[PDB]
Structure formats: C-alpha cells, structure tokens
C-alpha cells in the first residue's frame, strides 16, 4: 500500500523464524540421480510439463487447484533435467552456430571478478554513481573527479571501478577516450562494451531476416531482443516507452496504483532533465523534497527516454548474462538516500566556504564527518572544485529510491494458460537505485546512514552481499545458515515473486556455480532464449 | 564446484612464512597487544602497516598470518594504500578462499531443514557451532551457551 | 515423446517401453486396478526394473505428464481423422489396464 | 541383461541406521571376552581438571 | 590438563595428514573432505552429491 522499500525490507527480515524454501529451489538443488529416486516424489509429482512450472497453494475451501506458470526461457528448466554442463555444451554449440567473435579475454573477466569479490571496494564510487544516476549531463559535470577515481583505483589495485552499473560503462567508453584515465582501463571498458555488441550480433544472427507480422521474430526467440524484458536498474522513463512499443499489454504496479496507458503518464511520471526547466523548478522541487509524504506519494520522476540505437538490449545483455556470470551473481541492489549523500558532502567545511580555493587538497581540511572516513577508506584525494561540482547535482537527484513491479503478459504463444492470472510475467525493476558488489564492516559502518540493502532480483539478491550490507538479514542468516545459496534466499514478497519472475532459481544457480570464462558467458546467453515456437524454428535453423 | 580464488604460490608464501626461523617475534608482541580488538586495531594502523611493508620488502613473506583476526582486520581496514598492493591482494586471496570454502560447505547440504535448524550443523563439523576455534579473544562461550 | 536431456543411453539400448516405467500390467494381480495404477502411475515407488530410480523420464510416465496429455487424452474412436498413432499402444490407460 | 547402478543412495536403507551407530553391542562383546588385551594404555584417556 | 586425545575432536590421523601432505590446493580440498561427520545426515548429504 505504501511504496517505501526500506520499511518493506526491514519488516520482512526482522526476526523471521521459519525460512520457507520453495519448490523450484528444492528442484534445482539436488542433482539428476537423486531427483528420479522415489525419495523425492514430492518434487517429482510437480514436474509434468517442461514449459509450465506447476505448483499448489493453501486450501481456502476451493480444493486449492494447481496453477501452472510458464518457464519463459530455457534457463529456467529444472537443473536435474538440464545440468549446467549441458548448458555449457549448448552455449558452445550456439557459439559455433552464430560464430560470435569473443572480444573479451580471460583476463578482463578475471579483473571484473577481482572487483566482484573485493571487500575493499570504496563506497565513494557508489557515492558518485548515485550522484550521476544515469545522466549524460551529470557525467559531464564531473569528468576530472571520475577520472581521478578511475586512475587511483587502477593504480592502487588490479581492479577497475564503476563496472557495477551500465551507465558508468557506457559513459566512460563514450566520454573518457581523452586519456584522462589509463589506457588499460579504457581498453577494458571498451572490451566490455564491444562484447555487448558482439552478443547483440550473436542474437541478431540467432533469428534474423524473418518478420512474423509488423515486427520481426527477434522478440519471439529470446529474452534479450524482446522489449518486454526490462533492465533491472532504471534511470530513464522506460515505462512510458514500454507502454507504447509493447504490442502486448503491460501494467506497471506502483504502490497499488497500477496504470497501463500513456494517457495517465503525466500524473505518474514527472519528466525531469537537461538542467534548465529545473533552473526555474529548483525551489519548488526542493520544497516538494522536504515534505515527508513520499512513502505514500505514488509519483515517480526520471530522466527522458534517450533513443538508443539498440533499444536497451545492451543493458539487458549486460545485467543478464555478463555481470551474474563474472560476479557469480554476487551483487545486490542498494537503496540510496540522495538527501543524505548530499548532506555529507555539501554540509561540510571546505566544501561550503569559498575562501578555500578550487585546486587544493581537502583532506587536511575535512572535519570529523562520515565523508571524511569515506575518503580515508577510499584513499582518494579530491580537490575542492570537483567535490563542489559533485554537490552541484543535488537539485535534480530523486527524493529516495523506489521499486516498481512491471507486469507484462508472456507472449502470443505463451498465453495458452486457462487461468488469466497466470498469463502474466511480472518483474521488479529498481527505479533510480544502484547495484553494488560487496562490502566490509569498515564500509558498512560509514554508509549505515547512506545506503540500504534491497534483495531485489534473482541475480541481485545475494545473501552474502546483503549480510555485509544489512543487519537484520545478517542475524537472519546466522539463525538460518542454509539461506546462503542464492537460489534459496527468501526475498521480500513486495519486491520479488519466484513464480512470477523471468529468471527463477535455476538461472541463479547457473550464475553462482559457473566458473568465470567466455564459455560460461556463451552458455548463459544460451539460457536467455525462449521456449517459444519461433525459438524452436530458429533453433532448428542453426 | 569450488572456485579456488587463492593461488598455488599463495600457499607457497604462507608455507615459507611458516618455515622462516627469522620470523620476528615483535609481530607476536603486537599481536599479543591487540589480541583481536578492532579499537586496538584502529589505534595501531601505522605500526602494522610498517610491519607489512617491512616484511614485504625484506622478504617475500607476509606478516600476521598466524592469526585469523589480523587477516580479518587487514581485509577490513588496511585496503587504503598504506600497505603494499600485492601483499594486500594475497590477503584478499586468503579471505576470499575462506569465503569460498564457506560457500562450498553450505552448498554441500543446503535447502534441507530438519526443524528449526538446518541439517548443516550435522553433516560436517565446521558448520556445527558447537565446535569452537582453537584460539579465542571474545566471549564465544555465552554465545555457544545460548545457541546450543 | 519429449524427455529430459539426462535420460541415460543405457535405457535406450534395451527393449523398453517408450515412457519411463515399464508398465508390466501382466505382472500385477488379476482384475485389480489400484495396484496396476500404482505400478503405472504412482512414482513414489520404484519401477519393475531399475529400483534405484522411479522413471527414466518424468514427462511421459506421470499421470498428468506431457506425453500422457498429447497421446492418452485422445481416445482411438473410429470416425476421427484417424492417423495411426504408435504411442497410443503405449499410452492408452484403458489399453494399459486391459492387460 | 540390464545395467543397474548401485550408488551410495541405494545403500542408505542399511547404512545410516541406529543399529550401525551404537557401540553397546561391541562393548558387550568385548567385556564378555575371556582374554582382553594386555597393553591397556593410560596416557590420554581422560582430561584431569586443573 | 590441555589435550585429552580420546576426548578431543582431531585425533592422530588428521594431524598425520596435516604434517604429511604437501601444501597446495588439492591438499586443502582434501582437508575439507576430512571435516565431514560420519553421521547419518552426512551419509544422506554424500549420497546426494
């Protein structure tokens, strides 16, 4: 009823006694020989259909009939009936078929894996990434600051910064070709960004030169060219674009205020952008920001939908095959308080008075605050001008983060369910949020007042990351240790539904247990392919 | 499917630290002074950074690997360019390898509950919280007494 | 008949039934339907041959299974389209229980 | 002429059973022995409390 | 007063494997195969994997 995600995750995890595991997770845990044993008939009798995942709920007096939701991909097959080595071999067969060019090597995958398990990852990168939150203009307010960040993190370790989010990847690979970083960091960044193009080429050659109607079979063969699948983090108003370009019917659950039309857009989405209508809207938006109705205010504000050349397929491939394989699904979306990260930097001594000149170090002038210890554990040395222009973006960043539950019907060939409630495939999308790698207690003691954890998606709900990020989930996994598999974590129901999700527990298991290589990425791409009729057509082609 | 994040030569360096007759007992002295307290660790950051630097320059060995808690404290605090980079990467190799072993042991017998408690404390020894560390610095005993 | 990918080759070399459990309804007791439906469809007990498992595949031998739907739910009347279906010999529950 | 697999899961009906996890019948078979062992070590049998 | 071997967890053969093995990855992975109980629950977990 109220769209404050922090009280949702806090009151879901506070002293939960029993941690119920679901049928899908118990299915994907055991291997293929223990599955067909008669000792697991309670899981064997709920597997009759390869495409439909049959369950049964609580008897409310109406016999508790079986409901069958669709496993939209091949990746959500039960892993005793489709082991991970089979998916690696199928990805290699697909790699031979479409003949994709691997432009990433082992070493960049090992480098992003080294960033992934880095408990010494500085939270100041997340601070500046929260200050950008997917804006080109905000990225070009602060070029020397982010350049100093990338250079310092590339000399102090073998690790690269800002690979936790797509917007940073695209903005550095576009903007920072001007040698303001090291050449090796830029080469690695464009290796990632060209690997995304190579995967887009592999998918466009998986099913091309066929048009089923007005539109091609690209949305009918795979989860990656399908526009009904959304990126997990959203920084623009992709819901309004979704409501237009979807031939099928999407409905966007925003705090019991669902809307499926673009005619109801201006009373839901507050289009912000390009620094100049805000140049008059400043005092009014700040006065709206200081009123505390936002937990029951049901309005969003985002940047405008830029017309990307690939229809957000790069973000999709990124967050869905790249990061959960090299990180082994060891991410978690964090909810960020944008007023607090501004109150750290702006309400501060040398950042306030203009006696302090632009090009001088700040660390001997920083008073005993949270940002002081943040830059001390980040070992980073900024000047006054870069942090001042960093603080200059407070008047456009949102009030909090939020979370929407984007629902969309499955397909025209996955709509054959008799029950009309199970013809839908919902997906949570973290609007205006931030996805992180992993923390330590030294970081978490600083950003206790700044960030908060969200067990958001199947790939971004790792209890290892939330456990060093959140307290209630830490004592929860202490009282129940078996939750540490990412397929068996009990996520909040207001932000995740394991029977309504696109990616169920088998893709989370394949993400966690795979070894980081190009063969694993080629296998994971062969999981984001539909079990549609047109997908069987295009698979019998190649 | 354990992912050995730690490397073979890390095992060789910690084995060579075990065999060094000139392993200084001053590291044992400062270990005895801190005895696993985080406030005592943040008291003595530059001293232990000097220890890690001097033991990484006078040999290839790494100091303070005699105790879990110093590995935990270096992985926590000393990742801000006060020690040498490659020694810190080896420390993170150790700390990540412990994480990988914990992950593997939980993936041994997980998603299978016998009651209030999972089966994990009965299938191995090291997920049983009744088994205790050899050295102790904090009150693990009343914690055991509550959780037993 | 759709099966999973972990169906072993050792099954498909022996003269088996195409579904998982070899429905040896001759091997059950005379004129009894509950124990024969237990042998055919109840997967809590292992089959006649491979006692270390229930079925070589779960998408054919179960009662609500996929191949059971596409072949058994059709009943071989006379005035149908009437293409010969070979799996009607091995999936028709009336024909299985007739033995 | 089938090719059956006796894995470890088929032996659980006999192995992990409380008859196979009690020492009482072994100690009854040992205390009833007329000729016990003659070495009878006493180095580290029990911990004496200081 | 400290070490009673017939009351302790780690007896002599585990220490023999500790002193006897060569320090590598396969030695560590073999050491965690030795911290498995011979409990019925562990027999279930080992017939699973």
């Amino acid at each position: 009823n109220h769209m404050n995600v922090l009280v949702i995750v806090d009151e879901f995890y506070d002293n939960k006694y029993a941690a119920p595991v679901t049928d899908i997770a118990l299915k994907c845990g055991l291997p293929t020989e223990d599955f067909l044993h008669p000792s697991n008939y309670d899981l064997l009798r709920l597997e009759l259909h390869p495409l439909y995942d049959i369950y049964i709920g609580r008897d409310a007096g109406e016999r508790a009939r079986h409901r069958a939701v669709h496993r939209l991909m091949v990746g959500n097959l039960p892993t005793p009936l489709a082991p991970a080595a089979f998916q690696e071999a199928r990805g290699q067969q697909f790699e031979t078929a479409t003949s994709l060019a691997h432009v990433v090597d082992q070493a960049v995958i090992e480098t992003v894996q080294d960033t992934a398990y880095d408990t010494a990852y500085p939270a100041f990168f997340y601070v500046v990434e929260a200050m950008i939150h997917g804006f080109e203009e905000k990225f070009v307010m602060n070029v020397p600051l982010v350049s100093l960040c990338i250079n310092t993190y590339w000399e102090r370790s073998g690790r690269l910064a800002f690979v936790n989010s797509f917007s940073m990847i695209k903005f550095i690979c576009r903007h920072l070709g001007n040698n303001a970083i090291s050449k090796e960091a830029y080469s690695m960044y464009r290796k990632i960004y060209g690997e995304l193009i190579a995967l887009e080429q592999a998918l466009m050659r998986l099913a091309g030169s066929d048009v089923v109607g007005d539109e091609s079979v690209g949305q009918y063969v795979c989860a990656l060219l399908d526009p009904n699948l959304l990126p997990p983090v959203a920084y623009t108003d992709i819901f309004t674009h979704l409501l237009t370009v979807s031939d099928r019917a999407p409905q966007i659950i925003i705090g019991n205020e669902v809307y499926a039309d673009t005619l109801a857009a201006p009373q839901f989405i507050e289009r912000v952008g390009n620094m100049d209508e805000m140049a008059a809207q400043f005092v009014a938006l700040y006065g709206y920001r200081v009123n505390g109705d936002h937990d029951h205010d049901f309005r969003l504000h985002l940047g405008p939908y830029v017309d990307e050349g690939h229809a957000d397929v790069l973000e999709k491939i990124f967050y869905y095959v790249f990061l959960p394989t090299c990180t082994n699904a060891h991410m978690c979306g964090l909810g960020v308080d944008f007023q607090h990260v501004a109150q750290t930097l702006a309400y501060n001594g040398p950042a306030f008075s203009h006696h302090f000149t632009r090009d001088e170090d700040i660390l001997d002038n920083l008073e005993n605050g949270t940002l002081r210890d943040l830059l001390e554990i980040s070992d980073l040395r900024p000047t006054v001008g870069m942090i001042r222009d960093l603080s200059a973006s407070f008047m456009t960043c949102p009030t909090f983060t939020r979370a929407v539950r984007v629902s969309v019907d499955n397909d025209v060939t996955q709509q054959l369910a008799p029950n009309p409630a199970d013809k839908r495939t919902e997906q949570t999308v973290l609007v205006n949020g931030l996805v992180a790698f992993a923390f330590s207690e030294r970081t978490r003691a600083v950003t206790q007042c700044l960030f908060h954890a969200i067990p958001f998606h199947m790939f971004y709900g790792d209890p290892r990351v939330a456990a060093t990020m959140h307290q209630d989930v830490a004592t929860f996994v202490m009282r129940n240790p078996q939750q540490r598999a990412v397929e068996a974590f009990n996520r909040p129901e207001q932000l995740f539904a394991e029977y309504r999700e696109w990616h169920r527990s088998p893709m989370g298991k394949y993400a966690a247990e795979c070894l980081p290589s190009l063969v694993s990425i080629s296998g994971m791409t062969a999981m984001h392919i539909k079990m549609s009729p047109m997908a069987y057509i295009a698979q019998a082609k190649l | 499917s354990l992912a050995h994040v730690v490397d073979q030569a890390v095992i060789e360096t910690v084995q060579d630290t075990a065999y060094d007759t000139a392993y200084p007992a001053f590291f044992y002295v400062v270990e005895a002074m801190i005895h696993g307290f985080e406030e005592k660790f943040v008291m003595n950051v530059p001293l232990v950074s000097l220890c890690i630097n001097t033991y990484w320059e006078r040999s290839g060995r790494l100091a303070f690997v005699n105790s879990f808690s110093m590995i935990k404290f270096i992985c926590r605090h000393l990742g801000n360019n006060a020690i040498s980079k490659e020694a810190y990467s080896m420390y993170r190799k150790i700390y990540g390898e412990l994480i990988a072993l914990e992950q593997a042991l939980m993936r041994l017998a997980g998603s299978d509950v016998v009651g209030d408690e999972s089966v994990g404390q009965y299938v191995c020894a090291l997920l049983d919280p009744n088994l205790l560390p050899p050295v102790a610095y904090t009150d693990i005993f009343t914690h055991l007494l509550t959780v037993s | 008949i759709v099966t999973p990918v972990t169906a072993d080759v050792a099954y498909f070399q022996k003269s088996n039934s195409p579904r998982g459990r070899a429905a040896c309804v001759v091997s059950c007791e005379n004129y009894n339907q509950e124990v024969a439906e237990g042998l055919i469809y109840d997967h809590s007990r292992p089959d006649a041959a491979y006692e270390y498992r229930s079925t070589v595949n779960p998408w054919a031998s179960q009662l609500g299974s996929l191949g059971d739907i596409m072949y058994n739910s059709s009943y071989r009347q006379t005035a149908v389209p009437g293409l010969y279906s070979p799996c009607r010999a091995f999936f028709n529950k009336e024909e299985l229980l007739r033995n | 002429n089938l090719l059956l697999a006796f894995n470890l899961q088929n032996a659980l009906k006999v192995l992990c059973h409380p008859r196979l996890h009690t020492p009482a019948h072994t100690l009854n078979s040992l205390n009833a022995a007329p000729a016990p062992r003659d070495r009878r070590e006493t180095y580290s049998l029990q911990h004496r409390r200081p | 007063q400290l070490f009673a071997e017939y009351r302790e967890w780690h007896r002599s053969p585990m220490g023999k494997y500790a002193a006897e093995c060569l320090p590598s990855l396969v030695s560590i992975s073999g050491m965690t195969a030795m911290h498995i109980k011979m409990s019925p629950m562990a027999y279930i977990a080992q017939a699973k994997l």
Binding site: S39 | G115 | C28 | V14 | -
Partner: peptide, 25 residues
C-alpha cells in the same frame, strides 16, 4: 524424533517383479 523421521523420509522407510534378491551391506 525430528531427525529420526527426517532420515526415514530421506530413505525408503515405512514390488511387482520376480521376488528380487535381497541385497545386504
């Protein structure tokens, strides 16, 4: 009791062919 019936559920605790040979361990 819980570990006792948990084990009895994870094993075949409480036939159609040939009076099968009784294996032993």
């Amino acid at each position: 009791q819980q570990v006792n019936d948990y084990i009895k559920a994870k094993v075949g605790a409480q036939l159609c062919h040939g009076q099968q040979a009784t294996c032993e361990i």
